[PDB]
Symmetry: D2
Amino acid sequence: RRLEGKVAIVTGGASGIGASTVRLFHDHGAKVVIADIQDDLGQTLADRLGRNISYTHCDVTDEDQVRALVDAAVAKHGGVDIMFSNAGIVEGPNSIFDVDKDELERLMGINLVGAFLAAKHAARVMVPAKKGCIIFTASACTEIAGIAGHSYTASKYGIVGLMKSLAVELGSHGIRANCVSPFGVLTGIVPDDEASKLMFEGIMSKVGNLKGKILTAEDVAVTVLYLASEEASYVSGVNLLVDGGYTVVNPTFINVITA
Amino acid sequence: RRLEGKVAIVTGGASGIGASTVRLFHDHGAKVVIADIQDDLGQTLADRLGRNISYTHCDVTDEDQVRALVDAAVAKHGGVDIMFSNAGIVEGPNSIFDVDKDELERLMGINLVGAFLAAKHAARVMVPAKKGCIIFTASACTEIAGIAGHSYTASKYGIVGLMKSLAVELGSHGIRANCVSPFGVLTGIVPDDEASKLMFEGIMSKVGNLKGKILTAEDVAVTVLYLASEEASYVSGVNLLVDGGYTVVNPTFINVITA
Amino acid sequence: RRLEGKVAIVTGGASGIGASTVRLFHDHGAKVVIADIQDDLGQTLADRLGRNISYTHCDVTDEDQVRALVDAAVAKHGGVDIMFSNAGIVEGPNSIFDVDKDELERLMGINLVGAFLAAKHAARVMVPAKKGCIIFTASACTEIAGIAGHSYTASKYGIVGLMKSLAVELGSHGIRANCVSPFGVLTGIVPDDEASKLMFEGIMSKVGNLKGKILTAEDVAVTVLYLASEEASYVSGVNLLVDGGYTVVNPTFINVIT
Amino acid sequence: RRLEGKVAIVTGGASGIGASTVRLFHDHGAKVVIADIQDDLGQTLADRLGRNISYTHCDVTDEDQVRALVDAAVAKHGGVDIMFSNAGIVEGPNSIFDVDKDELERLMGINLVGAFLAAKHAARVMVPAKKGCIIFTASACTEIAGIAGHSYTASKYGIVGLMKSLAVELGSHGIRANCVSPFGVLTGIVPDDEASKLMFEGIMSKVGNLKGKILTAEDVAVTVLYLASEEASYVSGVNLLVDGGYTVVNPTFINVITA
Ligand SMILES: NC(=O)c1ccc[n+]([C@@H]2O[C@H](COP(=O)([O-])OP(=O)(O)OC[C@H]3O[C@@H](n4cnc5c(N)ncnc54)[C@H](O)[C@@H]3O)[C@@H](O)[C@H]2O)c1
Ligand SMILES: NC(=O)c1ccc[n+]([C@@H]2O[C@H](COP(=O)([O-])OP(=O)(O)OC[C@H]3O[C@@H](n4cnc5c(N)ncnc54)[C@H](O)[C@@H]3O)[C@@H](O)[C@H]2O)c1
Ligand SMILES: NC(=O)c1ccc[n+]([C@@H]2O[C@H](COP(=O)([O-])OP(=O)(O)OC[C@H]3O[C@@H](n4cnc5c(N)ncnc54)[C@H](O)[C@@H]3O)[C@@H](O)[C@H]2O)c1
Ligand SMILES: NC(=O)c1ccc[n+]([C@@H]2O[C@H](COP(=O)([O-])OP(=O)(O)OC[C@H]3O[C@@H](n4cnc5c(N)ncnc54)[C@H](O)[C@@H]3O)[C@@H](O)[C@H]2O)c1
Ligand SMILES: C[C@H](O)COCC(COC[C@@H](C)O)(COC[C@@H](C)O)COC[C@@H](C)O
Ligand SMILES: C[C@H](O)COCC(COC[C@@H](C)O)(COC[C@@H](C)O)COC[C@@H](C)O
Ligand SMILES: [Cl-]
């Protein structure tokens, strides 16, 4: 319903938040090109959801693969309304001494250069149409320290800055650009069924500021749907946190004086 | 659909963004109490919309009326799911030499003290329910100068701070608190197009950062609907700008070098 | 000697961060008018500091007293270079259920309405001078929740918003406006009471993000001195946190996993 | 006298803001190691400033050169009190279509990867000392769009994020980390030729929000001196704008309605 006839690309679409968004976009009448490098999981998802959902292999660090992915999408569906640049790799809290120069450049390539290229070539086909929507997956670490690694933190800050520059430049052509910044969702790893899922959703239940709710990838997908739809038709330049208020509080003082 | 069985109170509900939100909440199956001091406009709206929409006179500077309004809502519908604290008066850009102490205190009473009272008494009846949602109308002046008066700007910053400390305290009870900060909204004129819409586009087309779109009171109602719905069930502490990216740019530098 | 010949007004100048700044301003050659309602403490500080330091009773909620105070400063010293709008009352973390409408309005009058009046009447005499500096005492609660009460928090946000519109309007006249947002400040007992200082470090050494250092009123005064001096001659619109990084971290996640 | 006996390293110290900070540090009793890749400019400055100021060639993209530069400073002076990570190249505002993937990676290496390496190896010799200070040169583009290129902007956001997580990690060891974010300064950006000095001063006076003052490299150096001194001994995690309020205003609306 809400994305009837819209064409959307989702990088990192074969798993996690990307997969949830591909599924949600599908349920709302969108044509979605899943862009990923886990070809077996990604093609399975596209085949599983039917004719509007195609899979395209794209390593977002390779500009030629990104260029083709976008050119293929316009060729297939006539244009791209929504670019959800979501591919990235994750680092938990670490030390500056744990930062290896090669692993920093590797993460910057996937997380930040990939966002640049995905945006550049989405803009390439959106600007002539004078319409379109670019959404980046950032992270709640963009608003509070203590929940992600140094290299990762710098890369997501860089995305926020890129998102704001594009919101201005592409505003002249009627195109919006925003970020969604989730607070830790269960994804990836070996799904150590009960062991990993119970341990995660028990930690997050003590860590979160908003009690009685656990953030799932499906929750993030719904916020992406909001940003991508005409219900957000005047929303641009925004880094929208989905974090239950985690980033607005430092509870140390209150914890210390009462315990 | 999206607010089926939910009970909402809307201050400043008889006109403008409040009236638009009341109408949209009604369309989504919510029970709505319009709270205002424009008894003619407010009662007329409630009668037109039917059984689920009522009108209650409430001056938000009067704590007895604010307490009575929330207690009557529980008595009538059994609880309050959504408090949309939206009542306020507006000031365009002005000079500090124009700030009159009595007008400052009057605006603070309506804009900022009224928000405290609505949140205090909503929280009182939401906390036992272990669920609920407080949404304030702030303003895009909370993130850029140059679009609102001195007294008004300080009152809306105060609301943002209240919202963030409410998101922390009330998060322990499963309750969310957020702000919507709209930019240039056309109100007061009879919509469905008009002479009044097109020419307002004439102003905003030179002012806005996002070209080819004007913000309407109905667009803002839609963003409040998102924040108030279960689609935002892990969004809290957020001041959500609806400004087309106006607040993320100062184009003076680009303007001067391209003159 | 960084404020040689400069004229400063300090609201809430009779104690705490205000008094520390009054003393530091005096040490740097400033002429200071202490503005407060603690007449005895305030007159004593002014008498003790000498010819360049005066004292004026001024309830910042009373606009006539605020206008009179600034006009007296111009009449006495020829103008006002620095307005340190610092008067206010504090609230530690509390519940919205504790917010009393009369105490909310009382605090708003002092913390936020007083900030408007001080700034209005400073701007009035600074604009003809084409120079000057308005500095507000805000608070680190403007950038993190959990360290101040509801009413207090809203009043300090209001100050930040007021500061930013002032930086714009007064920027055209060469006038700067900034906030200082300190964290856990000792204030209370200025005289060398070691018992109270070490005990305060017992709390702050567990609460603060920057370890091995405690913030004092004299440290806040030094940061105000920077903002008020020509070393900050192009700093404007800034809410300057003095918090050791407290407001940039929520350590709950790391605490739970470790 | 304000940095008497302190040991400071300044990357990009041979020109511009870096050189200005080196001389001001020299004037305040500091021992300074100038770190740059412009060997003739840097060695000239170290010779003229005397015994306390030396020069070390260091390309900030090579971790071994950064490693050696910090070890050489410790070998000579016994430790490092101040790391002024200032090296970078600048981009004026541009279009996303102008972003070349190779140039993006080149700028990321200098601006952001270089900051990472400088901070890592400063932290290496500061953490045992239980004292120290890391200062990054970011940019006013970190708080509004419209004054820098896309690649440059994303790199300076990344620096801010890195600064925030260091202030937390290094806070437990008594070490502070901050950014200084200047607006437009006449340096090695536009040539020493006086035909470009009368023009740069004229643009900045029209563009700035604070009138009657032009930002110079010496003004920034003084703000770095504040951040690096014991006068800011409880300031950490701060991105300190030196911009005259440029980033807090979008004057478009006021410009059009009074045009
Ligand atoms: N999972 C969390 O807890 C969490 C928290 C905050 C932010 N995020 C962000 O959300 C985004 C999505 O991650 P996720 O949580 O859904 O886990 P995920 O790993 O299952 O999904 C991310 C996908 O990115 C793809 N990827 C890696 N390199 C790629 C490349 N070069 N080209 C194309 N795809 C590539 C992976 O194949 C993967 O399917 C990421 O950008 C991540 O940084 C996640
Ligand atoms: N119009 C804009 O462009 C704009 C821009 C930014 C923010 N806002 C905010 O939007 C909010 C909604 O106003 P609107 O723009 O839709 O038009 P509006 O002013 O007509 O509606 C606001 C209502 O607040 C009510 N009000 C004033 N005092 C009250 C009191 N004591 N008790 C109860 N109600 C009281 C008014 O009666 C009014 O109907 C306001 O808080 C306003 O500040 C509007
Ligand atoms: N104490 C802390 O830890 C802390 C933390 C964050 C912010 N602050 C801010 O520092 C500011 C100064 O207070 P302080 O902490 O130094 O304690 P303080 O008691 O020593 O100073 C407060 C001053 O405000 C004055 N005051 C109250 N009402 C006044 C009025 N009507 N007119 C004139 N002066 C009036 C008081 O007399 C007093 O001199 C306050 O705005 C406070 O919020 C303090
Ligand atoms: N001048 C301005 O208007 C302005 C505005 C905002 C930010 N900045 C920042 O100020 C910082 C300092 O640069 P500047 O403006 O003084 O101009 P600058 O070119 O005169 O000084 C920067 C120095 O970095 C050096 N550099 C380049 N690559 C290097 C490398 N790989 N290793 C070591 N040094 C290298 C340059 O040689 C130069 O001496 C930069 O990071 C810049 O981004 C400047
Ligand atoms: C294994 C992994 O958890 C190590 O990271 C913890 C660490 C704790 O610092 C945060 C505290 C607020 O000072 C640094 O590791 C310390 C050694 C002793 O294990 C994380 O520090 C980075 C901040 C930014 O999150
Ligand atoms: C620096 C520049 O952008 C500020 O202009 C001053 C200003 C212009 O308004 C005039 C117009 C009739 O409303 C607005 O002040 C800036 C505030 C918005 O922060 C001064 O206003 C004088 C009249 C409105 O009483
Ligand atoms: Cl935050």
